[PDB]
Amino acid sequence: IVGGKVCPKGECPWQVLLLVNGAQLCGGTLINTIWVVSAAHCFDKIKNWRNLIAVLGEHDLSEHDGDEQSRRVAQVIIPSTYVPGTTNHDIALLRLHQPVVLTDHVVPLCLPERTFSERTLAFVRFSLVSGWGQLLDRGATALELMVLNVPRLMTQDCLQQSRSPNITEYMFCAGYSDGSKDSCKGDSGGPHATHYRGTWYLTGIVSWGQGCATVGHFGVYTRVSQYIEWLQKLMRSEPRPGVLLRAPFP
Amino acid sequence: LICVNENGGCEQYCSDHTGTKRSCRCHEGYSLLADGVSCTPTVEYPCGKIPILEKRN
Ligand SMILES: CO[C@H](C(=O)NCc1ccc(CN)cc1OCC(N)=O)c1ccc(O)cc1
Ligand SMILES: [Ca+2]
């Protein structure tokens, strides 16, 4: 996260850290006790699918304080329409091997209904994006969880204000074009969370952009409202042998 | 009332029904109050709420 602040411990309780062989891979969002939403592109180069770990309740990567909960990832589900190395349909649904235990430091973000998200949440101007990604373009990653408030743009406005992948109906733009504030590489998969009448909801996934906080460009996020029914159907399904599952979309 | 305007007055989810009818609904872990619009937690850790801030108030 570029140009944000430290998220006070426990104030981003749905944030997930994904690790491969102990090394930081990406972020994610807890949406109930066994399900995590992340970005498809995070999994393009995975060789051993069995060394993927999700950590809940994380805050400071330098110390263990006892609030962290680690789980093996049992399933990584990606839409059929996603093509590795590209930008569209950048979403993954991860099944944990065992549920996390909800605590003051581990709480799911609400996955909204599609109608509510499209009719109401899409018009809330500002939302929070978070992660342990790069603090600067070409810079070191964060040791404490960072958070940033970003305003959402209608795609027509994003294109007019920007100055090269298309911004599709499965994406939206958010952030700033002055090079001060953005999510970055290592924040991929993390939440874009939107507040409405006292409750927070998942509206986007940190996905892509032109570098990080590049002047004349905004962050691009997966438009989660397009995937609500896809996600809900999969969460009602039985697990299948083998970690990676490509599932038809729509 | 209609769900596209002001969320139909609902705190969370809204359904339109045949003929000037509207039903509000709440996420799992919440129940709808008798006002027909408000949602109240029914569990200790409902989605989308931040315990340390909820206790803070
Ligand atoms: C599908 O995402 C990847 C990717 O690398 N995402 C990482 C990322 C997250 C957030 C932001 C800034 N909000 C920028 C980012 O990357 C900026 C970059 N790689 O220059 C991709 C693929 C193809 C493509 O053309 C561009 C990106
Ligand atoms: Ca820690």
Q: Which of A48, A61, A56, A41 is nearest to A185 (CA)?
A: A41
- Residue A38 near ligand 1, beta carbon < 6 Å: no
Hey, what are B15's tokens? 């359904």
Query: Which ligand lies nearest to the CA atom of residue A137 in the structure?
Result: 1
Whose alpha carbon is nearest atom 16 of ligand 1?
A: A208
Kindly state whether residues A101 and A199 are assigned to the same domain.
Answer: no
Q: Tell me whether residue A247 is in a domain.
A: no
Whose alpha carbon is nearest atom 21 of ligand 1?
A: A208
Range A113-152 burial, b when 16+ CB lie within 10 A, else e: bebbbbbbbeeeeebbbbbbbbbeeeeebbeebbbbebeb
Q: Three-state secondary structure along A132-191?
A: CCECCCCCCECCECEEEEEEEECHHHHHHHCCCCCCCCCEEEECCCCCCCECCHHHCCCE
CB atoms within 10 A of CB A214: 14
Q: Are A234 and A80 in contact (CB under 8 A)?
A: no
Distance from first CA to last CA of chain B, Å, rounded? 32
Kindly state whether residues A7 and A71 are assigned to the same domain.
Answer: no
CA–CA–CA angle A143, A149, A151 (5° rounding): 145
- Residue A207 near ligand 1, beta carbon < 6 Å: yes
Kindly state whether residues A157 and A76 are assigned to the same domain.
Answer: no
Domain boundaries, given as residue ranges, for chain B: 1-57
Contact A198 B11 (CB under 8 A): yes
Distance from CA of A194 to the nearest CA of B (A): 9
Range of the domain at A80: 13-108+226-239
Kindly state whether residues A5 and A118 are assigned to the same domain.
Answer: yes
Q: How far apart are CA A68 and CA A61, in angstroms?
A: 10
Q: Tell me whether residue A249 is in a domain.
A: no
Kindly state whether residues A102 and A143 are assigned to the same domain.
Answer: no
Q: How far apart are CA A206 and CA A212, in angstroms?
A: 12
Q: How far apart are CA A121 and CA A135, in angstroms?
A: 28
Kindly state whether residues A66 and A179 are assigned to the same domain.
Answer: no
List the catalytic residue out of A130, A188, A207, A225.
A188
- Whether A59 sits among the annotated catalytic residues: the reply is no
Kindly state whether residues A151 and A175 are assigned to the same domain.
Answer: yes
Helix/strand/coil for A232: helix
Kindly state whether residues A21 and A83 are assigned to the same domain.
Answer: yes
Task: Establish if B49 touches chain A: CB-CB under 8 angstroms.
Answer: yes
CB atoms within 10 A of CB A241: 6
CB pairs under 8 A between A and B: 62
Q: What is the DSSP string of B7-47?
A: GGG-SSEEEEETTTEEEEE--TTEEE-TTSS-EEE-SSS-T
Q: Three-state secondary structure along A89-141?
A: CCCEEEEECCCCCCECCECCCECCCHHHHHHCHHHCCEEEEEECCECCCCCCE
Distance from CA of B21 to the nearest CA of A (A): 17
CB atoms within 10 A of CB B35: 9
Kindly state whether residues A149 and A171 are assigned to the same domain.
Answer: yes
> In total, how many domains does chain A have?
2
Q: Tell me whether residue A164 is in a domain.
A: yes
Kindly state whether residues A117 and A205 are assigned to the same domain.
Answer: yes
CATH number for the domain spanning A141: value is 2.40.10.10
Hey, what are A183's tokens? 């999510």
Kindly state whether residues A175 and A96 are assigned to the same domain.
Answer: no
Q: How far apart are CA A58 and CA A42, in angstroms?
A: 19
Q: Tell me whether residue A113 is in a domain.
A: yes
* CATH among 1.10.340.30, 2.10.25.10, 3.40.50.970, 2.70.98.60 for B1-57: 2.10.25.10
Q: How far apart are CA A216 and CA A75, in angstroms?
A: 38
Whose alpha carbon is nearest atom 13 of ligand 1?
A: A219
- Whether A97 sits among the annotated catalytic residues: the reply is no
Technique behind this structure? X-ray
